[PDB]
Amino acid sequence: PISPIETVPVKLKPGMDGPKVKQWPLTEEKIKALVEICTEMEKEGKISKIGPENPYNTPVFAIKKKDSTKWRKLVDFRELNKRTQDFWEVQLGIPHPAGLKKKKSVTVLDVGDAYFSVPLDEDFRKYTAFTIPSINNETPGIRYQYNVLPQGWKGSPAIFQSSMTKILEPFKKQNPDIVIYQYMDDLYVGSDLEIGQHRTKIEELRQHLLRWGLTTPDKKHQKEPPFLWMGYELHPDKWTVQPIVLPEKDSWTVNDIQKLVGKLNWASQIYPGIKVRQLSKLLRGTKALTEVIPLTEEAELELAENREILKEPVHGVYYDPSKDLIAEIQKQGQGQWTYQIYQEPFKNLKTGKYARMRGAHTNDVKQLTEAVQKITTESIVIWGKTPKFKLPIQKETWETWWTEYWQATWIPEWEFVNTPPLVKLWYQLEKEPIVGAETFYVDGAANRETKLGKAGYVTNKGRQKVVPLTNTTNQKTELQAIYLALQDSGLEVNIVTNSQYALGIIQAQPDKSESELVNQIIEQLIKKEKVYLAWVPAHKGIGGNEQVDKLVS
Amino acid sequence: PIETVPVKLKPGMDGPKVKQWPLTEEKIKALVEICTEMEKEGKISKIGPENPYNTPVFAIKKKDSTKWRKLVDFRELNKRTQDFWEVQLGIPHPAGLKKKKSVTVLDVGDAYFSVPLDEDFRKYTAFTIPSINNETPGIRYQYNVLPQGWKGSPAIFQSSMTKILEPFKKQNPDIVIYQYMDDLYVGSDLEIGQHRTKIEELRQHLLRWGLTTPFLWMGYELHPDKWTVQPIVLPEKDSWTVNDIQKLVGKLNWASQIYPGIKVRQLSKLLRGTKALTEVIPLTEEAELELAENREILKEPVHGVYYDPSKDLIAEIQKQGQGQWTYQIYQEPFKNLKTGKYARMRGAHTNDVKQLTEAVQKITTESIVIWGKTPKFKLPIQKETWETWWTEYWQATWIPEWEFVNTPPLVKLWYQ
DNA sequence: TATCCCCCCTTCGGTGCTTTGCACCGAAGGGGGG
Ligand SMILES: O=C(Nc1cn[nH]c1)[C@@H]1C[C@H]1c1cccnc1
Incomplete structure (x- = not known):
């Protein structure tokens, strides 16, 4: 009836044994809820009971981060992660929508509990054993295991990626017109088919995924644009960052400042002109993580500039293979630069900032050589091609620097653009x-x-x-x-x-x-x-x- | 079928775990096409995620060729591959190859494909083919035969290579043959025509052996007889200024660690007064005597420099401007083995990374011919631009171990 | 008192001579996003 998926063997460390530890008692309500969930999963089939033949177990805690008091269950797999076959996760780079190609019809599929669909190793289920105390610990505990891939384990994402690749390789071979990017849970699918033909193809792919038992709820399966994909709202002709709001605090402490810095950096991908140097300058000299650091005039000026840039939303564009990538750099001063990787005038494909201080004694030309290097490597990662820079530096200055500096340097290709503040040898x-x-x-x-x-x-x-x-x-x-x-x-x-x-x-x-x-x-x-x-x-x-x-x- | 040879490793030291650097679209396309064809012919078989092992992979278009050739970095595997240095499969080095009119290299790397690899050690040749924009996970693969680049591949193939070499060597005792990695170094004292005819004969012999039992028509020439260690020479002059006198004193100090024969006392006595640099100091009789004796000493070739088989080789490089580079192979920081200088080439007149790449290739080839251990480079370049741009101009088939330096030597001691 | 990936900062700890102060790398831990 159903199509099974073959397992992938794992093993512990040679000479080292498994996890033999226990946790401390939790709240009675949380314990009862977890017990209900575990019994429900048992009668579903994922989890099987453990008898005396598996003496040692692994502790399990309760979390409530999802929603407010969801009683979401996770297991302290720390000792297990410390003691098992190290893995090589080959897919680690997160995709960037800039490189997405303009498909005339797009559909996003979301797999529900797909980590629980793939099976586990028979030998290692003995070490994948956990136990929950009874309601208010009336009885010391009820001992369980996982006949599926545990959530929160060393090899869970690696094995899931391998299994999904094995499942989807035949389908990709079937049709060379449909693109099916996937990162973990999401399954973006896009093609240049008609509005009905694409829907039929997605229906057939969904049935083909039900053949191995994968479930994809219709509520999560997106139907009309926009499609919210891994944090980037994908309109038909413009990707965009999912909107964010910065704190409006008046007593800024260290972690609030850090959150501001992080959100500014994260939003720097599409908003041109974001600066964080002086804002981060406050963090230097970590003394107390509770007190409130006063916002100096420079910090408040930078913060106001970030806010006035962030007021208006700006949208990027998809890459088009038939055009040539052109980049640009402007010198914001103090060691900050900006990216305008584009293909057509005033249509960004990406934006960023370079602010690392590499070397205790450096200057503008060296930092513009580290800027173009970063642009080049990131462009390789995301596009496969090196763009055509539009440098601020002037050819005479670049020649006088590179023919006479003791190391060896090279800038791929560029034409000088007249836009101050220029970079020149003082x-x-x-x-x-x-x-x-x-x-x-x-x-x-x-x-x-x-x-x-x-x-x-x-x-x-x-x-x-x-x-x-x-x-x-x-x-x-x-x-x-x-x-x-x-x-x-x-x-x-x-x-x-x-x-x-x-x-x-x-x-x-x-x-x-x-x-x-x-x-x-x-x-x-x-x-x-x-x-x-x-x-x-x-x-x-x-x-x-x-x-x-x-x-x- | 050559029976498999079990291979061990260092006790308690795991295999290779190295990240994959991102690659361009054309290189990825060529790499995936080559890998699919090699899987179709059974050389590589896809591997699962349980492997905690990985080595990089690059695609390079070799000289006068139009199809890319997969190159897999194997430095970690070579460094951790134990016992292969002491196993008698290592080649004794012919000391007569340094003195020969011509040397030609051959691409005999494809001949390693026909020997199956040991299955127990097989888990270590894992390599990943990345994907653009992280669309898909790494398309992992694994050799099923002898790899190209491992230090044990020629060691295992020594027997089958000697079974082919001995007839040719016995017939012609003049020709000396050496083998490093995938490369056959063959040379003779004959003229160009006779050398090319004998090399044709040799390649025909290899091809006929292959018939009976990336371009195979490529050929690169070398001339060991045109290599001379270059002693540093002091500037020739008769009217001397204070700045030139003191900078020559600086150069004599720079040469004080090379030789113990330079005397500087008299020319130091000439600089007791605190005169301006532009001021002209005519040279005296004692100054001329010391200068001439020191120039004679510098002309006299270096002494006390000797090889040590148990030590590594270090190849410093200094950029001297206008497309001029130098190099100083040594094993102990004072006893230089072979200095030199690489003049500019054509086509790289506006590419310092390219020029450094050509310099690296020419230094390594020289050192392989001379001694047979490649030197541990000390490149004067930025690590990130090097890792980003060395592939596009590299056309060899072996990779040495390099370390980068960021402190300026600030020396024109070697630039004459 | 859960796991794993990218990126962005700063702190302290190792290197190498750059000689013991200085420059310069490498993880630890801090947040953002998955
Ligand atoms: O893949 C995702 N996508 C996503 C975007 N927004 N919310 C979720 C899930 C976040 C990742 C995850 C987290 C913890 C353990 N395993 C996987």
């Missing part, structure tokens, strides 16, 4: 000493045992200044010496450091850094006209290096 250093500039010999020295040191410069003309400072590390003493040498002279200056660490920062050409010292050096170097630095082996009798070293000794 200051370009010199590679050869110039004629008509001074020469500063600087050096930093300090001791770890003293937490104090002296730094100074000895120019060619004899000018000298030794400024003693404490609590500043050696790399910092050197950085201070470079700062002094910059501050003393004019627009042009030749500076001859003796430190290996120092020069790396200045040559990297940062525009921003964590250290205020480095930020001051950047300010000075932007102010100057033509600066040339130079290295010199420390402690080798080289000109003024040892002359200032003896003074700062």
Whole structure:
């Protein structure tokens, strides 16, 4: 009569045994409800009773998160998950509707309790045993097992995905005109058939799924648009985020701020211009998770901007294979960028933001290379093709950067678009000493045992200044010496450091850094006209290096 | 039918579990077509979800070819495959291959398809074919024969390959043959015509053996005789400024860890005054003496550098601008084995990732010919762009183990 | 006092010399969405 589905073997850990633990007593009402549900499932056939032949069991708790007091049942499978054949879940990426193709007729099927339809392993049902105390624990417990895939277990989603793929592969082979994306519970089906032919095809697929006993309620089976699919309301010509509302709190505490940040990030997929940097800045320095952090002026400005963007709803569009993907990036400043992956003017297919700070001393060109890399990899994942960027950077600047930077970088393809704030090199250093500039010999020295040191410069003309400072590390003493040498002279200056660490920062050409010292050096170097630095082996009798070293000794 | 050879692994160390990087649409299409055909011919059989094992897979179009060839990364399996280094199936390395007029490579990888793989160890060659937009789950598969890329495949095929090689080697003792992975390295001191004729003969012999018992017509040429370790040379000059004098002192220090013969005391004495960089310091008699002696020492070839069979090989790379790269193979941070320099090529004049890819291939091929262990790279590139773009310009069939570096060397010591 | 996946942040813990402060990776745990 019915078509069974073959099992997939599982096993425990070699040498390690199964779960032997028990829980603590629950509320009498919750216990009675759970008992009713379990008896109902037993008389349905999913669950069978356990005799003395299976001594050890697994604890089971009660939850009410669904609705208010639904008495929804879940089992503490922790020990079991700690001790069984590790699995390789091959389907982990969540689909994105941007890549959906414009099917003239769409229908969404929802499978009810389909995790419970697939069977389990005979050998492992002994370890999939749980027991519930009687009503108010009058009797110590009633012991049960699962002859189906348990909800909340290591391999449950993997085995379910494999089983559904096995079931649906023949149907997909049958018709090469119908697309049937599925992620877990949902079963989107879409085709370019007529309004009646598509309905007949879906009816036949539903009967074909009833052949193995899968049940799909008509109430959950969507009929007319819109179709709410895994959080994205799919209209015939426009996907859209399911509408959300942000809290209107006046005493914002840490977790409320975190929820605001999360919802803003989640809504960033379609709303262009969302910024969260300064909003997240409050979270730095976690001290107390109960108190209320005041909303600084910058945070409230960013929050107001997010709200005024979120007032109006904006809708994306489906991908069309016959057109070419074009992306864009705008520089919001402070380390925030925006995506406008599209195919036609003013018809977005996706939108996002890049805000990660990678490196303690980086600049605009490096961050625009991390931005385009992220766009490229995400576009590969979601579309299979790399888009045609529309870069803000200018060809001359990009060439001058990539032909001279020590690593290797590459940007796939782009045309320069004129839209400020442009990305450009704030200051370009010199590679050869110039004629008509001074020469500063600087050096930093300090001791770890003293937490104090002296730094100074000895120019060619004899000018000298030794400024003693404490609590500043050696790399910092050197950085201070470079700062002094910059501050003393004019627009042009030749500076001859003796430190290996120092020069790396200045040559990297940062525009921003964590250290205020480095930020001051950047300010000075932007102010100057033509600066040339130079290295010199420390402690080798080289000109003024040892002359200032003896003074700062 | 070659009887199956049981294969063990390291005691108490599980097999390969590596994530699958996303792939483009054309590569996915080619990969799935190849996999379906290979299942039709019984080489690969679909596998279930109980496997806690996975290795990546990439599709690469090889040189002068139009059909993609499936390449499966096997680095984790090779590193954890035990006993195969000490099993006598390993090949002794011919020390005469370094000195030969020409070397040609052959695609004898397809010949491994005819030997069944051990069934107990079979669970470890699992690989997944991803899907675009996560439409479907991974289309998992598993070899049924010897894989292409595992360090044990040539080791197991040694016997059947020697049974074919010995007649040719016995007939012609001049030709030396070496085999690494899927590749046959064959060379001779003959001219181009004689070398090509002998290689034709060899390929005809292999094809006739296959008849009796991705393009098979491909051929790549190499010339080991045009490789010389390059000592660093100091700049030639007679009028010297303070900046140039001090940067040459810096270069001498940079060379102080390579040799113990460089003397810097006199030229340090020349820089006791705190003069401006632009100021011109004429060189003195003692300065010229030290400079000439040091230049002679630098011309003198490196000494104390020796191979250690139990240590790995490290191949640093420094970008020198205008499409110039360098490389320094070594085993101990001072005793460099073979330095070098890779000049620019044609077609990659605006592609640093491409140039680094070609440099990687040329370094690995060289090191295989010279010693037979590929070096552990230290690439000067961003990890994410590398992982995203190395496939589209890679055309080899073996993958070395690379680590990335983010600290700037800030050296022109090697750039002359 | 349930499981599993993507992504977005921050904290602390390991690396490597970048030498012991500094830069730079890697999970732990915090939320969003399934
Ligand atoms: O697949 C889904 N889709 C869905 C969208 N909105 N609500 C539900 C269910 C959420 C996922 C789940 C949760 C916990 C354990 N297993 C599976």
